[PDB]
Design a protein around this nucleic acid. Structure first.
Lengths: 564, 100, 28, 49, 423, 333
RNA sequence: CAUUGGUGAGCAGCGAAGGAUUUGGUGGAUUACUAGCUAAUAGCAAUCUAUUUCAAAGAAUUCAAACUUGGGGGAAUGCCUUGUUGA
């Protein structure tokens, strides 16, 4: 905001607070000087105290750019072999400032466009200037004359880089998602990488050739950083004329949109599943941040013989609104069941291969899958539709077995005991229904007051909890079959909640931007956090140690730990 | 020739043998301080030793119908087969159809 | 046989750069 | 700097025609031919046998 | 990687040095004329004797080989070993050999060229050290025993894998395989570089230029399906068409006309792109046969344009240059030709340009309309422009003659345009 | 593991050994692989014994003798626990010095252990043959170098080189000057005829791990990742003593003639190529041939050693050398 | 009559600007993420040399040393151990 921090290895080794209230906009270091330009066109130059020291510390001077000298400051650069010169490029022209004395030395001829980027070229005196039309100006500074002018039409230029490998290439990354490579000797365009980052999230926001390598690191705004190579030429004598196009090399990424549903994927607290509104299911890693693939939505070839009917334009699935995972049969058949927004069936997924499975699971009464659950043994998947029906599919062969018609509204929660003995469902008619499962009978039918919007089952104590619509959490023992606790105190809708790994707390995040920790034995709220941003998922670790939540804005997952 | 001159830059005088970079920059084994213009000339030559000088600055400077019109048009555009015709004609052998 | 287009392992050679902390100098 | 290394012409040391024989260069240097008396003693002994 | 792979790269680095008598016998055994036995028998004095004789003959036939008689065919060039010189002298030697191959590309039906390049092959090892220019220069001769010998000698590059199938066999490589070889894309980048160097050194000829325009036409025909592969074939072939048109030879200009007409009937191009191509054609159009070919291709480009603003007026400078290269008697002979190639859109744009710009040759307009059967929308546009010109310019008897001609033929369309504008 | 370089005596083949089991015998110049073996026992060194055709590698316990194709010919039950191999090439003797404090000479044409010699001083820390003399200089853990011969069961002469263990020694081709570095960060240039040490560099700023001397008197020292080369260091004149810097440009001091460093590595061994001007450095990741201009000698002798050599020439000379071998009791000082 | 045997010719059914099988290469993971080099309390990273030296400290088993051998017989000459003569 108003300060400049000087970190080494992550730790703030010095702070540099500026003497204004206007925010800092640009920042360029060179030599002993640090030049920080706050947004009202005034550049603060700080100096090293001792010429042996490691970072600038003391105030030195406060240059300023009035309106009659230039517009808003676009960038602050330094060129090589310029003693005490700071190249300040504004929206109208290019300036050179002597920083020790504090005296302007030169003002270029005003460009008839608006300048958006600057970049010092690896030759002497030359700076490249990207405008808001399609123009890259190669501008000299010893003379002050536009050496070259290269036109990209119908685009805004966002990031410029040069090559220093021994070839004279240029990379112009646009604000539309494109990245175009020029050869400056033949005045040619080698190539154009189309749509590497999303146009909707800024486009290409930085592109950098590494210093002497044929490797360009391009980062976008869609939570992704890539880097590409220039493979050497396939010819012998020609060489620089037959240039191979740039191929892919490494990259990291995440979610672009905020995440919708999270889930802890094993008991070690090693892996998280995270499905998000850009229709992507990722498998993040809580141990090492380079173990986190994206689960692949690449279908399997049918076992009947027909052809799978879809679009020939491949796409992603609809967004995920429920997930169930069970590690009991992993690496033998599928163990995730996911329920997508406004579709009439669920998908199986496989966490071993990190791929989709070969079965999809229908509801058979024209109803959307409103909730899903899996057996403990890993054999059965229960699909509760939006018309009451419970269909029970075998997961090895993905074949239908049963159907339970107790509800006539939607079924917002299913669970099975750890002994495969009893089975609870809860639905929007305010009804909890306790079925047997080894027989096929009904054991009981409880009716509460409000509708029921969520159910969480703790199998080690056989207690489940239902988030209602008179704004309360009803804790029901499943064996003796009655309400044992009724936690009151939320003031708006209850978004998400979960049990403690031992059965002692319920943590519930709700739409009044709060997260409350209720104690089950004594019955009262023992902790409350207020968040700046509403929390949409809360999941305890299967181990005791972590809490993982995720909010309305933000593309990540907040991790908390246990003082307890 | 240049377009600006810096009086303090001609005024200044810098050491050399206090750092290893500038120790590379020296010329005689008896010189130990060098004024600003000879300093920046040696730095400029050293920059040339690191990054060699290319043809695209060494020779090129952008300063009856011609014969460069086709090259100029190809250099400007990036999509050749036009789509903004909207001809009220129909393109052959490639059908634009959607399922409903 | 068509032309074998096939990518081989890359190896970051050493670099050489510049130092603005020599480019800047103090007064007399 | 005057760098100069050892450069040999295969035209000089491996002849062009197959039928022509190869140049056998010789370099008398006592360091390069070490065991004068031992080698001559073994040649004399093999000659008497 | 693996030790066999790194050693493979080491071997291909030292591929040409004769470290032993067996490698020497093999390397000196590969030859263009003599077989294995005699090529392994003979020597550099023999080869250079034949070289100097054949180069005297070649300089007598075409007088540009005297410089190679000064440098590449001297006794110091008997003596010097390519594998020992530094990279700078290697580069200059490669420039000398590339210039020689560009000159003696056009003479390969000749035992003199065979003997001179025999000396180059068996002294400077061009057939493994730089085979790219060797194959590109002698690529148009592709049925001939000289190309068979070149194939049996050369170790083939990455890009010539089809010929890597055809190497050391009995049948020649076939035209479909040459179409494959050109149908790769990096090959086309390489070959257009070769032709740009060839034009800049000003040594092209009719056989090679025929061959390369035929391969280019077949490449466009093979990729007629993919709109995307055609759209990335655009800059290469239209850049070589620009350079081929900037050339001075009528042969190069006709070959560029051929590439232009086939590529613009295979891809519906932009209006500005078509007009820029027309501008370069007319701006360098000099000879008479090239004039005939250029009129044919301009008519074809203006016809294959099908879209919005299809038939609008030629702009100012383009119309000026076009009339200066084709005054009215030439286009009238072209129109009363009996082959009758369809050119109605170009004619209509021509008359609209005359109506806006010149405002004199209206009897010429009447003769054009008498010789051509235009279409209905073209007649409507001509009539509308003439109505505007009659309302602005002072009325003239030639304009009265034009409207009398319309009322004679197709009066009700004139009534419709007057109903749109006027009484 | 960290590799280990040996060149042939013609300087036309290269034998690399890795600490795990990789042994490769290759032609290095035309890029051939003659024999590659993935032995799994940790291998310590290897020499081409008489040709490109037979080579002996030292393994976890026993020395093994392999053909030109990896066909194992022998295993030596008597050469237990060797780390240093060598081959006296006129005498046809494979010398192996080990961790058992013993030194064994094995005649490879007959098949017969010529001599077993009991070094008293425990496991041998270096070894180099005086070629002009064919006498083995071993370097013990005490600091003593010992000149040994296969007739006398006693060391011919003991020299106290350094304090604490000897790290590496190397003797000039002419048989006159020995260089020896010891782990007290020290390096001595000794004279061998009359046994008077010439000059003693005392504080190397890391111990010297390897030494080698070329056929031009170039002296190469490796003390970690660094390789350094002094030219005209092996003279007798007291101003030829190798230094690292000329204080104020003093023209008497001998600053290094060439320098290199292998940034992430730690060089295992090094050896000049016989008749080119290169030294091969075998280091933790592999093999590198440094180009050192004045290093190798240019004009060889064909009656002794050919870089260019037909198979027929090879086998005729192999029989000739078998016929003219010298007996192992003609090894004197 | 069957084929739980092969090779083919057609349907019913599935079915969005196609579909199926095989295959070369490269990238990321396969253990739980604190940055490169060196002579290292710092420096370099465009360089370590015209400070790279001096001072200090540093020398047992008077040599203890194969703990490292397929089984039996031996061992001229060697090698080891013990005594002896003569210098």
């Amino acid at each position: 905001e108003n300060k400049v921090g000087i970190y080494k290895r992550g730790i703030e080794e010095h702070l540099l607070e500026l003497e204004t209230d206007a925010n800092v906009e640009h920042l360029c270091i060179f030599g002993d000087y640090l030049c920080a330009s706050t947004d009202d066109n005034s550049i603060f130059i700080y100096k090293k105290s001792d010429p042996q020291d490691k970072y600038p510390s003391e105030f030195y001077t406060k240059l300023t750019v009035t309106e009659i000298q230039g517009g808003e400051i676009v960038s602050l650069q330094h060129l090589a072999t310029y003693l005490n010169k700071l190249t300040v490029v504004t929206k109208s022209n290019v300036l050179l400032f002597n920083v020790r004395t504090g005296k302007l030395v030169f003002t270029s001829n005003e460009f008839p466009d608006q300048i958006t980027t600057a970049e010092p070229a690896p030759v002497l005196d030359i700076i490249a200037l990207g405008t808001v039309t399609g123009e890259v100006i190669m501008f000299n500074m010893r003379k002050g004359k536009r050496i070259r002018t290269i036109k990209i039409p119908q685009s805004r230029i966002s990031s410029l880089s040069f090559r220093t490998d021994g070839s004279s290439h240029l990379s112009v990354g646009t604000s539309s998602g494109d990245l175009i490579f020029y050869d400056l000797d033949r005045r040619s365009r080698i190539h154009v990488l189309k749509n590497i980052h999303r146009e909707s999230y800024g486009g290409v926001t930085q592109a950098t050739f590494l210093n002497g390598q044929p490797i360009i690191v391009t980062s976008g705004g869609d939570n992704s950083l890539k880097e590409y190579v220039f493979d050497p030429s396939l010819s012998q004598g020609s060489g620089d004329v037959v240039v191979q196009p740039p191929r892919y090399l490494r990259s990291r990424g995440g979610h672009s949109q905020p995440p919708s549903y999270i889930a802890f994927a094993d008991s070690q607290s090693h892996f998280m599943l995270s499905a998000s509104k850009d229709r992507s299911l990722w498998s993040f890693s809580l141990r090492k941040d380079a173990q986190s693939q994206e689960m692949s939505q690449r279908l399997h070839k049918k076992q009947d013989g027909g052809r799978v009917g879809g679009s020939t334009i491949k796409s992603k699935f609809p967004e995920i609104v429920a997930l169930a995972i069970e590690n009991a049969r992993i690496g033998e058949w599928e163990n995730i069941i996911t329920a997508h927004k406004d579709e009439k069936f669920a998908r199986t997924w496989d966490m071993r291969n990190k791929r989709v499975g070969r079965w999809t699971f229908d509801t058979t009464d024209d109803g959307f899958v409103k909730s899903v659950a899996m057996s403990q043994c890993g054999n059965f998947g229960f699909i509760g539709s939006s018309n009451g029906s419970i269909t029970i599919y075998n997961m090895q062969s993905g074949i239908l077995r049963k159907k339970y018609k107790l509800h006539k509204r939607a079924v917002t929660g299913i669970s099975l005991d750890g002994m495969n003995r009893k089975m609870v469902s809860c639905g929007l008619d305010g009804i909890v229904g306790f079925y047997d499962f080894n027989k096929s009978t009904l054991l009981g039918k409880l009716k509460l007051d409000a509708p029921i919007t969520a159910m969480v089952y703790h199998r080690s104590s056989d207690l489940f909890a239902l988030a209602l619509d008179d704004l309360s959490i009803v804790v029901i023992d499943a064996v003796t079959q009655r309400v044992v606790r009724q936690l009151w105190g939320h003031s708006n809708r209850i978004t998400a909640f979960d049990f403690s790994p031992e059965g002692r707390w319920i943590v519930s995040a709700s739409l009044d931007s709060t997260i409350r920790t209720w104690d089950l034995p004594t019955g009262g709220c023992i902790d409350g956090i207020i968040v700046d941003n509403v929390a949409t998922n809360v999941k305890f670790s299967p181990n005791g140690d972590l809490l993982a939540t995720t909010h309305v804005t933000g593309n990540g997952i907040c991790i908390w730990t246990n003082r307890a | 020739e240049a377009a600006w001159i810096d009086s303090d830059d001609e005024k200044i005088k810098v050491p050399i043998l206090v750092t290893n970079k500038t120790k590379k920059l020296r010329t005689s084994y008896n010189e130990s301080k060098i004024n600003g213009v000879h300093y920046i000339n040696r730095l400029r030559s050293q920059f040339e030793k690191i990054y060699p000088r290319p043809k695209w600055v060494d020779d090129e400077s952008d300063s009856n119908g011609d014969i460069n019109a086709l090259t100029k048009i190809l250099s400007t555009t990036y999509n050749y087969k036009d789509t903004l015709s909207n001809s009220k004609l129909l393109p052959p052998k490639k059908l634009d159809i959607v399922r409903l | 046989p068509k032309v074998v287009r096939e990518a081989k392992k890359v190896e970051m050679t050493e670099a050489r750069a510049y130092n603005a902390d020599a480019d800047t100098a103090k007064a007399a | 700097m005057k760098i100069k290394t050892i450069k040999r012409s295969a035209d000089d040391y491996v002849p062009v025609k197959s039928t022509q024989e190869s140049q056998m260069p010789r370099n008398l240097n006592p360091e390069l031919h070490p065991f004068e008396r031992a080698r001559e003693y073994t040649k004399a002994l093999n000659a008497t046998k | 990687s693996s030790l066999s792979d790194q050693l493979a790269q080491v071997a291909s680095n030292n591929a040409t040095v004769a470290l032993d008598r067996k490698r020497r016998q093999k390397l000196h055994s590969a030859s263009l004329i003599y077989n294995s036995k005699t090529a392994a028998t003979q020597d550099y004095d023999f080869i250079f004797e034949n070289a100097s004789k054949a180069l005297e003959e070649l300089s007598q036939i075409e007088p540009k080989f005297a410089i190679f008689s000064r440098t590449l065919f001297s006794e110091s060039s008997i003596s010097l070993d390519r594998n020992v010189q530094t990279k700078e002298e290697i580069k200059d030697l490669d420039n000398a050999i590339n210039a020689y191959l560009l000159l003696a590309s056009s003479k390969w039906y000749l035992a003199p060229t065979l003997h001179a390049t025999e000396w180059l092959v068996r002294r400077f090892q061009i057939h493994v050290k730089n085979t790219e220019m060797l194959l590109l220069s002698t690529l148009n001769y592709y049925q001939t025993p000289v190309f068979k010998r070149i194939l049996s000698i050369i170790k083939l590059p990455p890009l010539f894998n089809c010929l890597s199938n055809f190497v050391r066999s009995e049948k020649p490589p076939t035209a479909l395989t040459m179409i494959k070889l050109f149908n790769d894309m990096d090959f086309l980048k390489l070959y257009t570089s070769y032709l740009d160097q060839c034009i800049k050194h000003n040594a092209t000829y009719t056989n090679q230029l025929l061959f390369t325009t035929c391969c280019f036409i077949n490449v466009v025909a093979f990729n007629s399906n993919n709109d995307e592969k055609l759209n990335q074939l655009v800059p290469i072939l239209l850049e070589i068409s620009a350079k081929l048109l900037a050339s001075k030879s009528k042969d190069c200009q006709i070959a560029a006309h051929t590439i232009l007409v086939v590529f613009a009937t295979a891809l519906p191009l932009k209006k500005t792109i078509i007009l820029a191509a027309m501008e370069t054609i007319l701006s360098n159009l000099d000879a008479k046969e090239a004039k005939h070919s250029a009129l044919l291709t301009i008519c074809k480009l203006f016809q294959t344009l099908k879209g919005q603003g299809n038939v609008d007026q030629l702009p100012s400078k383009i119309f000026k240059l076009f009339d200066s290269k084709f005054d009215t008697v030439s286009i009238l002979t072209f129109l009363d030709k009996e082959d009758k190639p369809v050119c109605d859109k170009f004619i209509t744009s021509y008359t609209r340009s005359i109506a806006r710009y010149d405002r004199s040759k209206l009897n010429i307009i009447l003769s054009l309309l008498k010789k051509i059967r235009l279409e209905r929308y073209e007649v409507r546009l001509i009539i509308t422009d003439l109505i505007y010109l009659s309302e602005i310019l002072e009325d003239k008897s030639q304009l009265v003659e034009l409207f009398e001609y319309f009322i004679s033929i197709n009066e009700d369309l004139v009534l419709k345009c007057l109903k749109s504008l006027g009484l | 593991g960290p590799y280990h370089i040996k060149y042939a005596k013609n300087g036309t083949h290269l034998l690399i050994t890795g600490r795990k089991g990789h042994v490769a015998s290759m032609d290095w110049r035309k890029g051939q692989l003659r024999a590659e073996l993935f032995l799994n026992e940790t291998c310590h060194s290897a020499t081409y014994l008489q040709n490109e055709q037979y080579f002996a590698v030292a393994q976890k316990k026993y020395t093994f003798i392999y053909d030109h194709e990896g066909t194992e010919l022998h295993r030596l039950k008597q050469h237990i626990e060797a780390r240093h191999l060598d081959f006296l090439p006129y005498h046809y003797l494979l010398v192996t010095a080990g961790e058992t404090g013993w030194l064994k000479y094995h005649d490879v044409s007959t098949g017969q252990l010529v001599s077993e010699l009991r070094t008293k001083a425990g496991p041998t820390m270096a070894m180099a043959q005086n070629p002009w003399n064919a006498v083995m200089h071993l370097g013990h853990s005490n600091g003593t170098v010992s000149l040994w011969s296969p007739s006398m069961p006693e060391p011919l002469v003991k020299l106290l080189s350094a304090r604490g263990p000897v790290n590496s020694i190397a003797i000039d081709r002419s048989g006159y000057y020995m260089a020896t570095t010891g782990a007290d960060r020290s390096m001595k240039i000794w004279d061998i005829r009359n046994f008077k040490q010439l000059h003693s560099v005392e504080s190397l700023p890391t111990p010297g791990t390897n030494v080698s001397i070329s056929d031009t008197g170039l002296l190469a020292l490796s003390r970690g990742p660094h390789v350094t080369l002094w030219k005209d260091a092996l003279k007798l004149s007291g101003d030829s003593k190798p230094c690292f810097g000329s204080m104020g440009g003093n023209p008497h001091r001998n600053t290094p003639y060439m320098s290199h460093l292998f940034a992430g590595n730690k060089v295992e061994n090094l050896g000049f190529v016989p008749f080119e001007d290169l030294l091969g450095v075998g280091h933790q990741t592999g093999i590198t041939n440094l180009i050192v201009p004045g290093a190798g000698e240019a004009n060889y002798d064909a009656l002794e050693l050919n870089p260019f050599e037909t198979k027929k020439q090879r086998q005729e000379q192999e029989v000739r050398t078998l016929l003219n071998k010298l007996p192992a009791d003609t090894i004197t000082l």
